[PDB]
Symmetry: C4
C-alpha cells in the first residue's frame, strides 16, 4: 500500500443522490444501541465508516439521562462500517469528547481530545498505536473538527481551536506524519472565530469550510498549503449564507472577507465546496433552529460577493423534522474525486422534553452526475414510543 494523494479533479455533479441511512433512534426503541452525537463519515481506500462520539451508555439505560452535556470522561470515539448501526459490538477507538479521523492510504489516524475542559489532552493514534499528544496551549477548551481530516502523500492536516464561549479562539493547523506532529501553523488571513471545520482535498492543497461561532452567519473558509505549511482564510462569498441562525434570504449578506455580523452565534457545523465560480452548499431549512436540511448550488457564489442566484435545490430533510451538524467527506473514483455529505438528525433534548436523553441518527448523500427526484429522509422515530 502507498499513500493517497487525491490527485484528480473534482467530479462535475448535478446534485446529490441517496447513499445511506442508519435508523439508530428507531432501532433504539427495541434494541441496545449507543447514545451518540457529533457523527461523521470517512472512507479508507477499501471502505466507508461511520463515526460518532458515544456517551458511554446505550439509550435504553438509566445512564442516558443527562446526555445533552458535551464533555464527560466516558465519551469515546465509535467506529463502525457505514450502514452498520452503533450496537454493542461497536469498537471504541479512543477516549474523546472531540475528534477527527482520516486514512492516509496505509492506516487510520484518529485525533482524540479528552480530560479537563481547560487542560485537555489530544492524543494522536496512528495504526492502532499512540504516536503523539499535545496539551491545551491556551487553557480554554481544546477542540477539533468533528469530521474527517485530510491526508496527502503521507501528511495529514487537521484544524484545532483552543477556545471558549466568551468568543476567544486560538486556532492552529497541525501537520501530522504517521501520527507524529511535524509542524504547527497559526491561522492567518481574515477568518475570525473558527470551529468544527469540514475539510476536503483540493490537490495539492486542502480547503476547509467552517463555523463562525460568534460574529458571522457566513461561513469561514481556510486554505492550507501542504507543501510549505502556509495558511490563508476568508468567508464564503454567497449572499445565501450557510449557518444557523441567520437572516432570511432577502436581508442576508457576505462580503467575502469579514464576518457579516448577522446572528452570528452560536452557529452550527456545516459544509460547502467550490466548483469554479459556483458553490455547492447545505444548510438547515429554518433560519432560527436546527430543523430541516437543504442543498443547492449558487451560481457565482464562490467568487462574487453576495450572489443570491440559486439553482438545483434539493430537500434532504423536511422542515417538520430535526436536523443537526453536517459535514463533508470525499471519495476517490477512477477519474475524479466525488463530494458527499452527512446530516446528523438529533433527537431528544433540548427540543423534545418527553425524554431525558439526547442522541442522533444520520443520513448520507453523495454527488451524482446523473438524474434524480425528490423526497425527505428524516430520523423517523416517534418520540412517544421511546424509553424515557
Amino acid at each position: 500500500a502507498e499513500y493517497r494523494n487525491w490527485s484528480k479533479p473534482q467530479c462535475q455533479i448535478t446534485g446529490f443522490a441517496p447513499f445511506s441511512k442508519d435508523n439508530s433512534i428507531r432501532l433504539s426503541a427495541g434494541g441496545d444501541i449507543w447514545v451518540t452525537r457529533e457523527p461523521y463519515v470517512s472512507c479508507s481506500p477499501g471502505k466507508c465508516y461511520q463515526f460518532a462520539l458515544g456517551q458511554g451508555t446505550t439509550l435504553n439505560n438509566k445512564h442516558s439521562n443527562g446526555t445533552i452535556h458535551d464533555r464527560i470522561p466516558h465519551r469515546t470515539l465509535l467506529m463502525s462500517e457505514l450502514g452498520v448501526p452503533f450496537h454493542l459490538g461497536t469498537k471504541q477507538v479512543c477516549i474523546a469528547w472531540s475528534s477527527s479521523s482520516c486514512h492516509d492510504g496505509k492506516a487510520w489516524l484518529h485525533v482524540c481530545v479528552t480530560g479537563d475542559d481547560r487542560n485537555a489532552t489530544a492524543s494522536f493514534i496512528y495504526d492502532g498505536m499512540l504516536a503523539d499528544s499535545i496539551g491545551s496551549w491556551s487553557q480554554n477548551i481544546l477542540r477539533t473538527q468533528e469530521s474527517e481530516c485530510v491526508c496527502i502523500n503521507g501528511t495529514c492536516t487537521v484544524v484545532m481551536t483552543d477556545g471558549s464561549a466568551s468568543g476567544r479562539a486560538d486556532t492552529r493547523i497541525l501537520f501530522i506524519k504517521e501520527g507524529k506532529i511535524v509542524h504547527i501553523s497559526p491561522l492567518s488571513g481574515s477568518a475570525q472565530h473558527i470551529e468544527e471545520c469540514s475539510c476536503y482535498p483540493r490537490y495539492p492543497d486542502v480547503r476547509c469550510v467552517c463555523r463562525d461561532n460568534w460574529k458571522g452567519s457566513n461561513r469561514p473558509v481556510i486554505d492550507i498549503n501542504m507543501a510549505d505549511y502556509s495558511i490563508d482564510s476568508s468567508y464564503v462569498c454567497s449572499g445565501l449564507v450557510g449557518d444557523t441562525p441567520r437572516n432570511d434570504d432577502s436581508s442576508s449578506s457576505s462580503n467575502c472577507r469579514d464576518p457579516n455580523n448577522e446572528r452570528g452565534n452560536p452557529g452550527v457545523k456545516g459544509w460547502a465546496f467550490d466548483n469554479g465560480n459556483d458553490v455547492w452548499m447545505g444548510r438547515t431549512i429554518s433560519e432560527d433552529s436546527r430543523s430541516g436540511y437543504e442543498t443547492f448550488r449558487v451560481t457565482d457564489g464562490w467568487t462574487t460577493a453576495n450572489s443570491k442566484s440559486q439553482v438545483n435545490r434539493q430537500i434532504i430533510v423536511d422542515n417538520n423534522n430535526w436536523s443537526g451538524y453536517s459535514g463533508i467527506f470525499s471519495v476517490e473514483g477512477k477519474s475524479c474525486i466525488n463530494r458527499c455529505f452527512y446530516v446528523e438528525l438529533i433527537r431528544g433534548r433540548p427540543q423534545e422534553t418527553r425524554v431525558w436523553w439526547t442522541s442522533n441518527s444520520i443520513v448520507v448523500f453523495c454527488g451524482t452526475s446523473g438524474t434524480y427526484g425528490t423526497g425527505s429522509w428524516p430520523d423517523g422515530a416517534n418520540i412517544n414510543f421511546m424509553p424515557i
Copy 2:
C-alpha cells in the same frame, strides 16, 4: 479477479434440494431482529448473501406497527451472509423501498430506489461507492426486480418499470458497467405489463420471467441480448400457469404470445426457467392466495402452447402455511451453471390480524442432479407467541 461470464451450460437437474433457512420470525420472539419484506439471494464467486428491504425497525418495537405499507423513507437494503439472520449488526447498504443486487466478479452492484412516489430516485452503488443515479421517467412509482440482477463480462442488466400498474406502464432495460449506466433499451415484443422480473444468465444473453400485474396469470418472458442491447418478449407457453391468482389446472391456458385474461390481478413475484423444450417453475399451491409453494417441470412447457404435462413435483411449503414472493438466483460450478430459488414466508398483516406488523422469513433451495426426498419447510412461528 476477472469478470464473470457464466459461459457454461446449465446443470441438468432432477429437482431441488434444501439449502438455507433463516428462522427470522421464530427468532424475533426472543431477540432483536429486523422487520423486513421483499427478500432475495445473490452470490459472489466467494459467497452467498441474503438481502431484504428493512422497515427501519426491529419487530419487538412499537415502530413495527403499520409495516404493511410498502414505501417509507426509512426502508433500507439489508445485506447479510446467507444464514446469518438480520440482527442489529446487519449492514444497511443503501436507502431503498425497491432494489436489485448482483456481483460482476469484482464487486457488488446495488440498485436502490427511494423517495416520493411520483418522483423517485434510483441510486447505483458499485464497490461501496455511489456511481450513478436516475430519476423517474413516468412519475408513478419507479420500481425494479426485487431479486438479483445479472452481469456478463462486466456488463450488468436490470429491468425497471415506471408508471400506472393498470395502463401506460413503461418498462426499460438498463445496462450498467462499474455502476455507470451505459445504455437503456425500451421493452419490445408482446409482453404487456411487466413487474418484478426474476432474471438469469443464459450465455451470451440474459432471460427474465416476470409478473403480469393486470391481465395475465401466465408469466411474461423477456429476452435480453447483451451483445447488441436488443430486446424481445412473450409469455411462458405452459398451460400450467405460474401466477397467483389463477384458474384451476383444467381451465387455465396460455398461447405463448398474449396475456391470458384469466384472473390477471394482482399477481405475485415468481420465477421459471427453460431446459430445452421443458420448463421448471415454482408457484403458490393455492390458486387464490399466497399460501403454499410447489415446484415442478412441465414437459414441452417452454416451446408448446398450453402443455399441461407435469412431472417432478415437490412441495416446498405446505398449503397450511403462508408463502410470498419467490425468485431465482444462479451459481457457477466447475462445469455448469446451477439454478436456485428462494421463497418469502410472509407473516402478520393482512392475513394474520392478532399482530400489527408484517414481516417475513425465507427458505432457499438449489438445483440438484442427485436424488432427494420430501418435506415441508414453512416459517414455523406461532403467531400467539409473538409481540403484538
Copy 3:
C-alpha cells in the same frame, strides 16, 4: 492452498488438558442464545469451530417449548468460532436435523439432513455451494455422524445410517470430492448396528469408533480404506467398555469381534482411539445414565480382548452433573496430529422438568504430553435461575 493429507504420526500423550468451555446455558439466562443439541468441533488449517444443531429459536423465547424433539424443519446447522457462544449473529450454514462437517484444506464440506423422517434429503454443501444430494435409500430415518468427517487428499468420507427404532440399520460409507459423491460402499466386517461415528484420520486411512444402538455396550470400530474404498469393522477390545448403559467394571466384557450383549440399548455417541496396543477412551461415569464423564487409557486395550488395566484416569465432569454426547476431533501440529474431544452437557428435559426446553453447553479438552492436576468442569447453570 493445497488439500490436507494428515500425513503425520499421532502425538504421544499422557492425558488431556482443558481447552475450551462455552457456558451457553449460564449465558442463556441473561442474553439471547440459541437452543441447541448434538454439538461438535472441527478445525480448518487456520482455526477451530464449534457446531451444533439449532432448534430455530433462542432459549428465552416461547418457541423453546418442546425442544426435546429431535426432528423439525426449523433445525439448522450452526457454525461459530470455538469459544464464541451461539448468539444471534451466528451463521446457519444449512438446514439440518442431522449433520457432519469437515474442511479438506481448501473449503468446508457440510452434510445436512432434513425433511420427512422417512423420506429425508441429505444435502452436500461445499465451499458455500450446493454440490449434490441424496434421498433416503431405505425410507427409515437417514442420519449421519454428528461430529467431524475426515478428508484426505481431496476425498472426504462420511458414515451414514438409514435406520429405525426396530433395530434396523442400513449403514453406508460415502466418498465425496468437492461436494460430489463419487462412490458409496456398504458396511462390511463384524460390526452390527452403527450410529453416530466419531472418526479420525489415521493416514493413509480413516478410522471410526461408533455407537451400537441395540446389542453392545462395547463400541464398534470401522476402518475405511481411502485408496480402494473398501471397509472393515469390529469392536473395541477393552474390557472396560465405553457405552452407556453398561455393566459394572468387574462384569463387563468385549471379545473384539461381536457385540457383547450387555445392556446394548440405547447407547450414546462417544469416542476412542488407538495408540499401539493401548486405547484412549472417554465415557460417562454412571453405568446407567448420561451423567459424569471420565477419560483414561487401557494398557493393551486396543489389541488384547478384555483388558481391564486402566491408567491415567481423569474426571472431566463429576457424577453429580449431566453429560451427553461426546466426540473426537483432530488437530495438525507442525510434526504430529493431536486428538481432542468435546462433551455435550445437556440441560432441561427429560431430566430437569422445571423447564420446558432442552439445550446444551460444551466443554473441550486436548491431548497433552505434559503434566496436569484435577478438577470438574460441568455446565454450571442453576436450573432455578432459568426462563422456564
Copy 4:
C-alpha cells in the same frame, strides 16, 4: 512474519496520554455484558487486545450473584479487540481462573490455569492449539501474572507461583517456545514473596515488577536473562512505594534489598519501570484501600535507596473512585519501545453492597514524549442504576 526482538531503546517519555476506555459497567445496565475481573492488555504487531477473566455469566443475570469468589470452573479468558466491550460475541479463548497472554511476532500464547485449588492445571495454548500443560507443584493455588508475558526472539517468559499466600511460596520462571515449556528456573536473589508480576522487555532481557503479599509494601523486582535462563531479584529502590496498603510518604521506606515490613499485607497488583536512575510507577492514591490511581516519576528512584523526589505526577482516577489491579504492556514503534498501562476499575462487592456481583471496567494510557493536560477517568457507573 519474523519473531519480535524488542531491540530498540525505550522511548524517552514525559508522561502518559489517554488511549482507551471500555465503559463496561455503564453498558451492563442496558445490555448483555460479561461479568469479569483481572483484566489486562497486550498487542500483536498488528493490533491491541483487551483480556479478562469472565465469570461465566453476564451481569444482568442471576448467575452474577456471588462473583466476588475468584475460582470457579466456569471462568474463561476473554479476548476482544481493544475498545470492543465484552459482549455476547466475545471469544472465550481458554478455561482460566488465572492467566497471562502474549504474542511472539507470529502467534498468540495463552497461559490458562484452572481446576482444583490444591491440584490445578496450567494449559499453554499457542496459535489456537493446545501445546503443553503443567500441574501444581506445591498443591496450593497455582497462579500467574494476570498481565502480558514477554517474548524475545521466539522465547516467551512467564512467572508463576504456587503455595501459601503469606508463608513460603514457590515461585518459578517458565520459558516457552511455540507453546512448549523448554526450561524452568527457580526464583533467586533477595525478593521474598512474589505474586502477579508485571513484566516488560528490556532487550536482551526481561524485567518484572511484582507484588509482595506478606512483608513488603515496597515492590519486588525480578530480572530474567533470556539467553541463559538465570534469575536475580531485589526490591524497587524508591522510598515512595507502590503497593497498597503502605505507610504515608514521610514514613515509608525501601533499602533495595529486603521487604520493608510496613503494612505488607495483602498488597495489590501493580507496575513500575526504569529509565536510567529514575523510576516511573503507578499506585493507588489511597494508602489504605484500592481507591484512586496516580502515576509519577521518582528521580534516582531506581538506583538510590529511599529516594522520595517525585516529579511529573498525573491523576488517572481520582480518589473518590474505585480502582483495582494495574499492569504494564509494551508497544514497538519505528525507532523505540513505548510503555503503556491499564487500570482495573472494580465495582460491586466487597466495597459496594447494594449489589451482589463484582465486576470491573478498564482505562488505558500510553507513554508519550509530547505534552498533555489533566483529568480523571473513573468507571462512571451509578451503582443505583444497576441490576442488583
